[PDB]
Design a protein around this ligand. Sequence first.
Ligand code: CA
Length: 281
Amino acid sequence: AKTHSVETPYGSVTFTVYGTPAPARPAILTYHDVGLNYKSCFQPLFQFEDMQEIIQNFVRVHVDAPGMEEGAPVFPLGYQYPSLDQLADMIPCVLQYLNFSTIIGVGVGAGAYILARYALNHPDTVEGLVLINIDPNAKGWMDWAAHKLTGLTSSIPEMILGHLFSQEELSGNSELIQKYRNIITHAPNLDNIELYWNSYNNRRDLNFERGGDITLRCPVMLVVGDQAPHEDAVVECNSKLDPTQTSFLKMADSGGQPQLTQPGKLTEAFKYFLQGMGYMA
Ligand SMILES: [Ca+2]
C-alpha cells in the first residue's frame, strides 16, 4: 500500500498502488471527479467488502489529479492548470513508472472523460472501461450561457455540487449531501479544485461515431443515475459506441454519485462486466 508521485510535462501527479503483484491481469486504474480525490470519490466503493473480494486478484492504481491529493499545496495565482487532454497525457508516465502495460480504467465525470481520452490515445493498453457520468461532448454555447447565468447567483462550491449531485438531492439535504457540501465548501485546496472545474468545463469533443474510426476498441460499462445531471450525456454516449462491446447501467435511486450511494449494485455490475470481458470474477 504505497503512495507515489511522478513528474510529467504538465507537472507531477500522485497515485496510490494497492494489491499483490498480478502480472496476467490489467491494473485497475481509477480517476476521480471535480471536487473530489480518490478518498472522497472511490474509497467507499473500493473498501466495500464485496469489492475487496473482486479486486484482490488485481493491482489497483488510484490517481489523484494534480493539486487534489491529501496535503496538496495550493497552486500559486495564475497557475495554468492542465486541460483534460493534458491530464490524460500524464497517464503513460504513471504506467511506465510502474512498468504496467494494460489497464481497466474506472472514472467518474471529469475522470471518466480523462480515461476515455487516454483510451483513444493508447487503445492497445486498455482492456476495458467503466465510465460513470461521462459527458463526451464539449460544452455547447447554449449550455455555456446557462452556466454563466447560474454563476451570477451561485458560488463555485454550489456549482461544483450541482455537477456532482442532482438538484433533488441538494434540496433534499441528506447527511451525505451535507457531508460533501462541507467537504468542498471548506476544502483547504478549494482554489485548486476550481482550476480542475475550469478544465472540465473547457474540454473538447471525444467524437465517438458509430461505425466510425474514432471509437473505443474494448468493453465499456457506461453508468449513470436516472434523473441525474449527466443522464442525457451518458444516454447519448451510449448511442455512439459499439453496442456489442458496450453495456449501459442506468440506476434508479442512485442520484449523481452512484459509487457513493449504491456501491453494492455497482460492485455486482463490475463483477458481471469483468465476466463479460473474459475474466473470472
Ligand atoms: Ca491477461
